[PDB]
Design a protein around this ligand. Structure first.
Ligand code: HEM
Ligand SMILES: COP(=O)(NC(=O)c1ccccc1)OC
Length: 289
């Protein structure tokens, strides 16, 4: 099972920079969503959920096929709340109908990270929409009520190592939980990309409590929360070492996150030797827009 990248016919960097700019401008103007958090965090989640169905064993799932557009995946209970990101991107897709679904969903995650003052994330085009029958079954995305052992084992399926896992989890500095989506409540409601996740993990006084949906979560007096799977990163001695590294080195965290996130969005795709180099898009700020 091979998924070959195929560049949308006759399109070049400037075409994709246009799509980036439309997403970025809409992020700026549709700023009231989720109590003024804006759509940055949910688009990052969306890009992760469409990628995180990949299975290294048989090469099924992942971002290539854009299969989130089909009802089985769209209605996965693990995807509750992501409809909001879909609705955000829908008018963009009408404006640029030439872009594939997988390219649009993954580009939306890249745009959101960079527009939230995160690291540059190189991105490659050429995902190709595949038929409804290529949609993975529900149940490939991870549960939040588990320990470090489960996290490590789960992420092996996506071919991610300990450092890649800890770096990717720093995205939990963004956005918040919503009781209606996941049965978890609270969070910091942040829309600037920083290494605060690790600082919070190490500096807050956490207390395990049951919440209003009867799930266990870690709460701090300051009002922050951590999922059981977040808190597992300071329970396991290998993850804890890396948490301390990122808490103490913002630049290292940005660079590692960029690498891991691009790998996540590219898993399962074979790029021809003569495919274009990855693109690095300019932010609105860098264009003076
Ligand atoms: C063990 C793996 C993970 C688990 C169990 C997990 C679980 C969750 C849960 C339960 C929520 C709250 C959903 C809601 O109530 O709206 C959430 C939010 C979020 N997750 Fe994760 N997550 C994981 C890994 C990741 C990764 C790898 C990323 C991206 C690189 C990511 C990005 C986000 C973002 C940005 C939000 C906030 C979304 C919003 O504010 O709407 N997560 N996650
Ligand atoms: C940085 O805010 P947080 O309170 N964690 C979150 O806001 C958060 C965000 C998304 C998913 C889970 C927690 O830090 C302990």
């Amino acid at each position: 099972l091979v998924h070959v990248a195929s560049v949308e016919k006759g399109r070049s960097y400037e075409d994709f920079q246009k799509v980036y700019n439309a997403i970025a401008l809409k992020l700026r103007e549709d700023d009231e969503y989720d109590n003024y958090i804006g759509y940055g965090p949910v688009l990052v989640r969306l890009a992760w959920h469409i990628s995180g169905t990949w299975d290294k064993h048989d090469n099924t799932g992942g971002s290539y096929g854009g299969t989130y557009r089909f009802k089985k995946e769209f209605n996965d209970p693990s995807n509750a709340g992501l409809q909001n990101g879909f609705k955000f991107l829908e008018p963009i897709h009408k404006e640029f109908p030439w872009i594939s679904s997988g390219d649009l969903f993954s580009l939306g995650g890249v745009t959101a990270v960079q527009e939230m003052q995160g690291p540059k994330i190189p991105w490659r085009c050429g995902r190709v929409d595949t038929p409804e029958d290529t949609t993975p079954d529900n149940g490939r995305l991870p549960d939040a009520d588990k320990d470090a052992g489960y996290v490590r084992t789960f992420f092996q399926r996506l071919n991610m190592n300990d450092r890649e896992v800890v770096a990717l989890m720093g995205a939990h500095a963004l956005g918040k939980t919503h009781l209606k989506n996941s049965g978890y409540e609270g969070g910091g409601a942040n829309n600037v990309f920083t290494n605060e996740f690790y600082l919070n993990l190490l500096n807050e006084d956490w207390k395990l409590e049951k919440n209003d949906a009867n799930n266990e979560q870690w709460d701090s007096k300051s009002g922050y929360m951590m999922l059981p799977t977040d808190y597992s990163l300071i329970q396991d001695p290998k993850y804890l070492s890396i948490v301390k590294e990122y808490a103490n080195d913002q630049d290292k965290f940005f660079k590692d996150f960029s690498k891991a996130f691009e790998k996540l969005l590219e898993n399962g795709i074979t790029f021809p030797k003569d495919a274009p180099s990855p693109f690095i898009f300019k932010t609105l700020e860098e264009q003076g827009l």
